[model samples]
Target chain A: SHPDLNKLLELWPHIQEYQDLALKHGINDIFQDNGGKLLQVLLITGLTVLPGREGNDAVDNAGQEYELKSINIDLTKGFSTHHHMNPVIIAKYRQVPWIFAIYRGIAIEAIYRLEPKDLEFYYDKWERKWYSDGHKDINNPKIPVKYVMEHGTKIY
Target chain B: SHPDLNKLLELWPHIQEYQDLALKHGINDIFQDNGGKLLQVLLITGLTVLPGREGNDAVDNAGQEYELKSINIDLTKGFSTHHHMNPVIIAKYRQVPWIFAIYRGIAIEAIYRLEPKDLEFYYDKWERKWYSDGHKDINNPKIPVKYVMEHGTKIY
Candidate 1:
């Protein structure tokens, strides 16, 4: 867990250059897919990694929970994988207050703080339907990836 | 990257028991969902975490490629996700030799060393039909998860 925000802030420029080099090579998929994990390690001051924990990536110094998801320009439309989908479901199911920290190219994009109750709306309307419907339709329980971009609080 | 096979071997018991814990909790869905990423980290020694590599998890010590897929006792029946589906397609398209390591329970269950030529049989017989036919059916391109279990070269 990195506790020093000042030290991480210092490395921001170099990280962007590293991002640029990978993007230049046209391995944007690789670059985009991994960008979030790297950001979680380098940024997210005072965060702890908890392997196999549902809907929670790390806890902050104040013991606040955060779920990290990265959105590249491409994924601005939405995410398709269950990796991103399940966290939202689990968070809602457990009724825990979890902050979703979304990242985009080279830096943190937006942080959507969602409570368990807030997730209830989505769980009932979209996620639960998708699950019971045998996953025949994924778009039904869509995450507001785009909505968050337009409305979420910018962290960086 | 773990170069020492001995250290990885030592964790076998703990990992197996850990698998049992999740299974016992009746969160098999969650356990099944998160299993692959963990196996990739612990077993694939010297494996790089390439976010979007075509058909494999990472290049091994000799730069040979490998794909890591975990097999729960239930998944022995079949896989419903695209993670298992895409590798076969990409492997056939690229014509590269990629080792597909399938782990069952906690230890390595089967290692299906395949190449483009090996996939030709599948591509023509089953995979091709599934793709061309719009997956109205998926039982056609069956992965040998079950067959391998009964008679796979176990590496534990």
Candidate 2:
């Protein structure tokens, strides 16, 4: 489900603040903190952030699980598969939605949302064609940040 | 400007036919030909493919220039900076629109349309950071097929 419009507007300022700080620091794990902040903003806007056991960030009113990822333009060297384990494993075993927050400098540039099916298909493709290691974790296939942005559903 | 809905339904089957033929051939220029056929399908639906000087594909009833690109899953190795000279140049220099026709195997799966501003911003980002080969054409940056789908408006 989509977040409430009024709550989103109410939390927009804080979201911007989180975004600014994340960019200002440009350090390790800052984007992760900012990702939580973004989830907080979404929660205030009517979504519910699930606990760690849930293996995803939040759930919309419609009960759909949403996995959140943030990309910091300045500090990100490259994207990896093992960075976040819960969502990857859970989504692979059981489908879940994903929300990507793309930040350029001090602002959230765009939001790319993807349903479980798209994520699953991409994973399936990677496993079928690209996976070479017999012991490679199918749940955590390293994907380029560029690849995610190119294929996700751009909500913003 | 959007295409006529009634007209689109009329041409859907033909579009599928082009998609199939393009896949069956699986040669070098099949996709290029498929692009034209996709345009032809739209023309048969009542839109006019603009003359060469326009530097875009077709003009809608409002005379808005619309650039069209197609992605055939089986055949596309990757995107290029010089595939079609018109749309990229027109979009970068003049800020026109782009419509991406995404195909799955032998069928058109989705149609994603993007406006001028989005096109301009992506182009700007490309030039600012992603561009290489100083002498390369700024008007035609090589964009990943995935990027176009993720960011574009899913029209169909």
Candidate 3:
């Protein structure tokens, strides 16, 4: 319900590395060339809230809303389990095109210096939701995927 | 160079909803649907380092290495701000026939809330090379479009 977005925004200097990396890879304007599809993804995935939260300018902005399209996500947590990777689709809000989010989840069970699940699947949730703390139902509608795939596999 | 893999992996339980949502959207497989032309897309967009490290099983392996094609990501964060919606994209690794990730990022100006110049165009560095990290000149052969298309315009 509440997140320190102001803090995330603080990480821009660092995240800029990612921005550079993306644009270098050919993403064009990573900030603007989404074609209205990215919005659909986050809404469907439950990453972005449903607009109208305190201290958050995102929810109130008049853009698109998403109708829940079909979605599938892995619910396992241990690093030993193999899971499915799926996309979350959100129908358009307002009169804009719908948005979709490509998300995944992973379990934490690695004892090596660096493993697949070791490198990627790092967030800890309550149950299975993306925003909740780690004691809830990690299997909610938000968190992304289960198994950690190679980098270019999901995002280039 | 480094991300909290443990923290990122924790997001799985949340993001799995996309699969069911995509199905509802008539998108059986997002990779093929959204990223039908993965390699070509990689040719257009550059690739990034997937999150996880690899592992080898003694004898029981799915042999899921053939799917090493190209990588494509969805600019969630950037799109979120520009469109006032969410950001998301489907990426494929090439080892599997299915789409594995729903890539997401934040907005530049949204990020600028903290760092005023977060989105300030760096035409000088880009003037040198899109692939160079301002460190080494590392060009990606997979990238399709050349030249930086700032201010939102077509490259060709």
Q: Which stretch of 10 consecutive residues in model 2 chain A shows the poorest summed lDDT?
A: A24-33
Misplaced by over 4 Å in model 2 are A1-156, B1-32, B39-46, B77-94, B129-133, B138-140
The worst-scoring run of ten residues by lDDT in candidate 1 chain A lies at: A22-31
Clashing pairs in 1: none
Candidate 3 per-residue C-alpha lDDT over B3-108 given as tens digits, one digit per residue, 9 for 90 to 100? 3233233332232233233333233332332321222222222222232433210111343332122222342212211111111111112112211222233231
In terms of lDDT, which candidate is strongest? 2
Give a tens-digit lDDT track for model 2, residues B22-122. 33323212123343235323522234556557667666788777776666666673344443334345445445677766655323566777777666765
Deviation (Å) of A63 in candidate 2 = 65
Candidate ordering by DockQ (highest first): 1, 3, 2
Ranking by lDDT: 2, 1, 3
Candidate 3 residue spans exceeding 4 A from truth = A1-5, A29-156, B1-156
lDDT at residue B144 of model 2 (Cα atoms): 66
Per-model fnat list: 0.00, 0.00, 0.00
lDDT of 1 by residue, A128-148 (tens): 665777764443244667655
**What does candidate 3's lDDT look like per residue over A1-156, in tens digits?**
212233333443433443344343334332343312233333223234343333221221344333222122333333321132112211111222222223231111211112223323332222134233433323333322333332213211
Q: List the residue pairs that clash in candidate 2.
A: A150-B146, A150-B147
Identify the CAPRI category of the predicted complex in candidate 3: incorrect
* Candidate 1: segments with Cα more than 4 A from true spot: A1-37, A40-42, A79-94, A127-140, A149-151, B1-156
